[PDB]
Design a protein around this nucleic acid. Structure first.
Lengths: 59, 180, 55, 141
RNA sequence: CGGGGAAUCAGGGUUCGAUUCCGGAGAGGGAGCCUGAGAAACGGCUACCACAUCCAAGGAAGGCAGCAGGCGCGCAAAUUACCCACUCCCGACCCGGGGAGGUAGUGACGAAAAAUAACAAUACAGGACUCUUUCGAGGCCCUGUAAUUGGAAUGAGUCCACUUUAAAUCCUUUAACGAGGAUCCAUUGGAGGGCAAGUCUGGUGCCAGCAGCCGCGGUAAUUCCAGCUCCAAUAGCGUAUAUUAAAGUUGCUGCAGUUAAAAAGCUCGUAGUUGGAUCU
């Protein structure tokens, strides 16, 4: 035997609203960002160092 | 803090005296009779039996109409009957103290495979179980220390995927038949 | 005075170990120990011989 | 004899601790003067620097020279004598060498023929004397 | 730091508890505050004390007993990895964030399971059943030596794929390859006694050394150094140290005090301990 879990939704709209994004990405219905954690942590700190509309310039 | 459990036991005790000839001979006789790997399997069965007898001896100190004594005693008696060590007629708390290590060693999967004629030796039985040729009811069991329940003994089979079972002969026969 | 170090170990002639067949391990070794001590037993009137007894 | 009254608890426990102080192993463990006289300082092992090589003469019935070493421990600066067990193993030791030392087995008591040695050399230049003696490893310098 | 608890243990006990749960304390040391419902808060501020960074020499900025990591210290302890998918928490919030936590890496701390081969035929060898006065004659099993043969079953590994998962890895499931002893070769200690197993052979000659203890070694060494053989445990086994049982050698259970260690020179006496019957 192989034992797993399964779900059948009523429509694709409810499936998109109620599945986790990773089980939607296994069917090609989601695209994850390619940025890692450390890049956006360091970007967040770097733009924490600056003030105002100049925050959007750094990156 | 982590989401991990740290509960673990030791399943045997090392004996008090290291070199006593009577104990060495008796343990080697057990190993030869039942085809065991080392002294630790003998010590493990001995420790299990000692735990059972300590539990029964703790139960016998209470009054005969005590609720804990009755409940735990029938639980222990049913557990020892189900593995086939006790019998239905002698299902009493006093008979538990009359149990042997050789009583528990007959209930291993190795011994039961050897007794039912599936194997021609006790060492051959241990090999056959380890080689994934033996199934119990429907599950393939790879462990020789598998204690066979009384209702589970009547159907021990050859695990149809095995060469001795349904089909698909193994590596050696496929190589030798593909010579010419 | 005196106090040599490694005198005898450096004196003793080097004898090479002979190449022998390997020993069985695990359950097979215990099987061989059981079959040697309890199965093919030779009766003895007083049993004064050990396993490593020579001469 | 002993007091056996129902109210003699503090007499019993006070006399117990007072006569407990008369036990030699208890006084070694709990007075705290042996722990500060111990060079290892409550450690299984210590690491030191070889100061010199010593021939220690064996006690009266046995005639031998045991090869020992005077070492100064790194962590407290105390000086000890450690025995180098096997034959030819003193030749693996040079002066001003880094050496791991353990006790010899009788808990601070001298052992066998050797007068006044409580310690043995375990490792020389961070490689074991066993691997050097059996020739499994090589020693740096 | 204290508890929950842990090791050991007949019964009584002894020892441990920095350590993931509950409580407390503190963020280099002291001290004083602001904000706030809540802090005498330190990934807030202000000082002094001790350290220490950038300087253009005027000034400016500090606080890993958080996560990784480094130095130092030592007998003594892991990656400057990936994710917020799970568990939950915070926010104006179904949406954002979390080195909390999760997942991998290192990991013989410790615990559980468990390989290193099994079988068949022959040649010797035993022990049994039948027939024989016996010798013997057989078809009944067993055992290793097999410098004897034989094919069968395999997991280790190699490695498509599926499954796992946030993405992976691992485990599991599976194609294909993968086993005859010079291999896919099991170690660590020991062999006088305690304590299981050699008065074997060679070398050394109170030397080198072994030896927890008793002892061995000074020319037949059962103890050193080796070879062979044997013994114990076995993927494990030594050694050092702390501790527990052995220890009825701390004795409440349960020890002693003539001669072995030990009762005060003697009496009085307070606290302490103990205290005669007797009431339906």
């Amino acid at each position: 035997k192989t034992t797993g879990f399964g779900m059948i939704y009523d429509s694709l709209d409810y499936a998109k609203k109620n599945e986790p994004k990773h089980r939607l990405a296994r069917h090609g219905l989601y695209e994850k960002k390619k940025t890692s954690r450390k890049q956006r942590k360091e970007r967040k700190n770097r733009m924490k160092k600056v003030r105002g509309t100049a925050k959007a310039n750094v990156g | 803090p982590v989401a991990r459990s740290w509960v673990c036991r030791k399943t045997y005790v090392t004996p008090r005296r290291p070199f006593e000839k009577s104990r060495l001979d008796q343990e080697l006789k057990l190993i030869g009779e039942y085809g065991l790997r080392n002294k630790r399997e003998v010590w493990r069965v001995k420790f299990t039996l000692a735990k059972i007898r300590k539990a029964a001896r703790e139960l016998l100190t209470l009054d005969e109409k005590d609720p804990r004594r009755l409940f735990e005693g029938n639980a222990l008696l049913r557990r020892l009957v189900r593995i086939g060590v006790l019998d239905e007629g002698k299902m009493k708390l006093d008979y538990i103290l009359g149990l042997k290590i050789e009583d528990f060693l007959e209930r291993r999967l190795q011994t039961q495979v050897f007794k039912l004629g599936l194997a021609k030796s006790i060492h051959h039985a241990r090999v056959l179980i380890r080689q994934r040729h033996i199934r119990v009811r429907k599950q393939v069991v790879n462990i020789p220390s598998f204690i066979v329940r009384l209702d589970s003994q009547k159907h021990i089979d050859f695990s149809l995927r095995s060469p001795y079972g349904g089909g698909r002969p193994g590596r050696v026969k496929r190589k030798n038949a593909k010579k010419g | 005075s005196l106090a040599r170090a490694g005198k005898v170990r450096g004196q003793t002639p080097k004898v090479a170990k002979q190449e022998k067949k390997k020993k069985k391990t695990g359950r097979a070794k215990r099987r061989m120990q059981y079959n040697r001590r309890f199965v093919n037993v030779v009766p003895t009137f007083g049993k004064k011989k050990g396993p490593n007894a020579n001469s | 004899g002993k007091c056996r009254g129902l109210r003699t608890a503090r007499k019993l426990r006070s006399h117990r601790r007072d006569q407990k102080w008369h036990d030699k192993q208890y006084k070694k463990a709990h007075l705290g003067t042996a722990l500060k006289a111990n060079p290892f300082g409550g450690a299984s092992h210590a690491k030191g620097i070889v100061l010199e090589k010593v021939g220690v003469e064996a006690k009266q019935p046995n005639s031998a020279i045991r090869k020992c070493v005077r070492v100064q421990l790194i962590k407290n600066g105390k000086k000890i004598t450690a025995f180098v067990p096997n034959d030819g193993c003193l030749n693996f030791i040079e002066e001003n060498d880094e050496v791991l030392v353990a006790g010899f087995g009788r808990k601070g008591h001298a052992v066998g023929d050797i007068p006044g040695v409580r310690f043995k050399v375990v490792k020389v230049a961070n490689v074991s004397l066993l691997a050097l003696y059996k020739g499994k490893k090589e020693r740096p310098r």
